[PDB]
Design a protein around this ligand. Structure first.
Ligand code: FOT
Ligand code: FOT
Ligand code: ZN
Ligand code: ZN
Ligand code: ZN
Ligand code: ZN
Ligand code: ZN
Ligand code: ZN
Ligand code: ZN
Ligand code: ZN
Ligand code: ZN
Ligand code: ZN
Lengths: 362, 362
């Protein structure tokens, strides 16, 4: 009665470690990942301190190796000062992340020339990923063409963005992209329920026409990724609400509900949560790793999922059909019906595996 | 000095077993595969007898398990009589192959209605592959749309075909395709050297404009595959020359030469010989499996490669830069500098592995 899936990959998560101000860490975030059927995560570099140099990467590597319950890779972050300085550690990271719109001071790039410098100095065979909204998508595509290499666009959220990427792909340009579940299953219509605090996210929630454009152009979407961005309700309901939603535990149930409704096929889902993440970021296989899901149980998303320390969710009240029953990670039972059974530190840095290095010419 | 590649996959080979008239068999063909850096092959069903029913599949399965030196999956072949009869064995095959142009009597389909019947009865989650030339590509795409499922087009060889597939992909249609090395590295200009016998292949060799269109539209090509079709020179130079080239041992050296010349990147190559074959046919990973190549040695392709029993090659005289030095298959040294070190029967049917079944809804 259960369906066996491969180990699913989430290439866009914020686990807030290193850092001292948030409740989420590698241990709680990867517990949430396992409960969502996710056995490998790529963690973003906008931590405190941000992962913008080799010492910060070394610290984060050890914190994750000690806390992670599933396997992982860590992004490096582009800064106004580190272009040309990351060559010796670049291969050990998931890739390079550029924050091209709003971000905090250490990751801010003040000029497209700084984008160009990163595209020119980052090793050409390694992934580059960009937070790029609206016209910024076109701008970074231009920089990628000027430097003759590929780029991956995070969380595409608008009709404008997906149609631009569609046009670029039709001209044969090397661009891939990812879409997050809140931009497929939430819209402006939900802001009345969520309110202006909880509803804050970047890219912002789109119109009904944005959501319909993403579904209509599913063929253009290479990956799904949660953009798990945990903040507590104390932050979201405060005077300066930070943007972001938690999403590791809800993403697969939401997408399996869409499969059961015929909105996409099981294959469409597995291309975007397994095969394409593997090939875009050259993430290695996980031996003896699989997820068992139950597609019969209908349940309502509660006010908070059990594991993420965010302790809230914007999908509260939505009806879903699909449950993660069991996760096996490298031969060990990692999750069964609401209980995580692997300790912090079970997870490993996949870039240190022999099959986890990105191939390159000598 | 050596470059480590993952285990490469060739999704289109003819190994002539079962059969009694050709010299190639599973043991010699998979030896040729290993020498070409290929650790997994998918074998086509136009054998003698053809794999068009469960008893023929059962025989071929055991012959391959006893003779194969690398891992494999076996295609089923569509016939005018077997639509609706393959449901119980379909999941054990690589996929279903339709011969929509020239073929021998048992695999001939006399009507598009017979194509429709196969698209309607073959399980919707399992791969369908088609030999479809020129307008036949458009026709089978129409049948795929009428039945609301995907199709993979074998050995695309013409500007006409790749531009049609490009247009279909731009409308979001689920079509993938493969291109063989002889349609990238040989053209009509080589028929003077090859002659009308050796030059016989289906799809036929294209014009210089066909070859240039395939390279210009590399973004449209999902996979490379050899279409290894061994015939001896006694057949090729006879009165009724059968179509086909051997190609397992030459494909990777040819493509690595193009990489060294900047015609495509190493990543472009590995998407088309590893990642995309995996995701289109849902082929499982091979643990502890990798290929070591030497990109410095320049050599001239001889009159015949050492292993294929075809004992000739159409690429004789071409200069290449790139050599397979070592292949490791599931922890065992399989090939080193011209010596195959795994015996017949080392290879396994990947569809029998737990990770090798195609996911499906209950
Ligand atoms: O780190 C976060 O919380 C965050 N939240 C968002 O909504 N967009 C971001 O780009 C981001 F970095
Ligand atoms: O089996 C063969 O030899 C063969 N040779 C070709 O050139 N085209 C085919 O479609 C084929 F089935
Ligand atoms: Zn972002
Ligand atoms: Zn993010
Ligand atoms: Zn916060
Ligand atoms: Zn890879
Ligand atoms: Zn690798
Ligand atoms: Zn063919
Ligand atoms: Zn063939
Ligand atoms: Zn023959
Ligand atoms: Zn698969
Ligand atoms: Zn599988």
């Amino acid at each position: 009665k259960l369906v066996r899936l491969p180990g699913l990959i989430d290439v866009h998560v914020h686990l807030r470690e290193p850092g001292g101000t948030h409740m989420e860490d590698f241990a709680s975030g990867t517990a949430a990942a396992l409960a969502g059927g996710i056995t490998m995560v790529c963690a973003m570099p906008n931590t405190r301190p941000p992962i913008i140099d080799a010492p910060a990467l070394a610290l984060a590597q050890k914190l994750a190796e000690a806390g992670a319950r599933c396997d992982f890779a860590l992004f490096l972050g582009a800064s106004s000062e580190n272009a040309g300085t990351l060559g010796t550690v670049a291969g050990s990271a998931a890739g390079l992340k550029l924050y091209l719109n709003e971000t905090f001071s250490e990751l801010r790039l003040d000029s497209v020339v700084q984008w160009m410098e990163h595209f020119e100095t980052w090793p050409s065979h390694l992934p580059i990923v960009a937070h790029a909204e609206q016209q910024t998508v076109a701008a970074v595509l231009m920089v990628a063409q000027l430097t003759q290499r590929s780029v991956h666009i995070c969380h595409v959220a608008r009709k404008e963005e997906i149609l631009l990427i569609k046009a670029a792909k039709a001209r044969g340009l090397p661009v891939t992209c990812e879409v997050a579940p809140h931009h497929l299953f939430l819209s402006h219509d939900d802001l009345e329920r969520l309110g202006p605090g909880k509803g804050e996210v970047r890219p912002e929630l789109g119109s009904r026409q944005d959501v319909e454009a993403l579904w209509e152009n599913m063929a253009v979407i290479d990956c799904f990724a949660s953009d798990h961005a945990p903040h507590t309700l104390e932050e979201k309901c405060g005077s300066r609400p930070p943007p972001g939603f938690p999403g590791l535990e809800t993403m697969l149930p939401l997408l399996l509900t869409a499969v059961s409704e015929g909105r996409l096929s099981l294959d469409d889902l597995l291309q975007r949560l397994h095969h394409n993440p593997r090939r875009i970021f050259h993430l290695p296989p996980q031996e003896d790793t699989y997820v068992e899901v139950d597609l019969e149980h209908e349940w309502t998303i509660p006010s908070h999922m059990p594991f993420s320390k965010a302790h809230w969710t914007p999908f509260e009240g939505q009806k879903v059909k699909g449950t993660v029953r069991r996760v096996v990670l490298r031969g060990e039972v990692a999750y069964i019906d609401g209980q995580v059974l692997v300790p912090p530190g079970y997870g490993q840095d996949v870039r240190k595996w022999p099959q986890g290095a990105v191939p390159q010419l000598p």
